[model samples]
Target: GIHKQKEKSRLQGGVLVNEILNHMKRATQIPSYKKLIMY
Candidate 1:
């Protein structure tokens, strides 16, 4: 995640994506709700 953020910053000149989709290859893995309960 950090790597992606740094890469994005380097290209955008200090601009951030606000929300990055790193490590989320599958649609199911990406959470849409507010609460995320971990086991």
Candidate 2:
């Protein structure tokens, strides 16, 4: 018997929003630069 691991688990930053033609993307973040959302 091994006390290593019995099972595996999964996990899930990168914030910001997205939209077509940069609509909601801009409306929400106000603006994005370098693929980064802003306030």
Candidate 3:
């Protein structure tokens, strides 16, 4: 049961990341307008 829970969590995490990337892409209509900053 624990293993299954972990697997589900991982799947949801991927979906969350995918959604975030999609939203970011939509937010930046122009490629030049998007800036990626890493600290």
Each prediction's total of clashing residue pairs, residues at least 3 apart in sequence or on different chains, is 0, 0, 0
**Candidate 3 regions with alpha-carbon error over 4 angstroms:** 1-13, 24-39
TM-score top scorer: 3
- Candidate 3 lDDT over 1-39, as tens digits, reads 675654434344467678776566444556554465432
lDDT of 1 by residue, 1-39 (tens): 665654433455222333454434347766655565643
Q: What is the lDDT for 23 in model 3?
A: 61
lDDT for every model?
0.47, 0.41, 0.56
Q: Report the Cα lDDT for residue 13, model 3.
A: 49
Model 2 alpha-carbon miss at residue 35, Å:
0.4
RMSD to the hidden true structure, all candidates = 9.3, 14.9, 10.6
Provide the global lDDT of candidate 3 against the true structure. 0.56
The order by descending lDDT is: 3, 1, 2
Between candidates 1 and 3, the one scoring higher on TM-score is 3
Evaluate residue 11 in candidate 3 and report its C-alpha lDDT on the 0 to 100 scale: 47
Q: Identify the runs in model 2 with alpha carbons over 4 angstroms from their true place.
A: 1-30, 36-39
Please name the candidate that would achieve the greatest lDDT relative to the true structure.
3
Worst 10 residues of 3 by lDDT: 4-13
Error of 2 at 6 (Å): 55
Sort by TM-score, best first: 3, 1, 2
Candidate 1 lDDT: 0.47
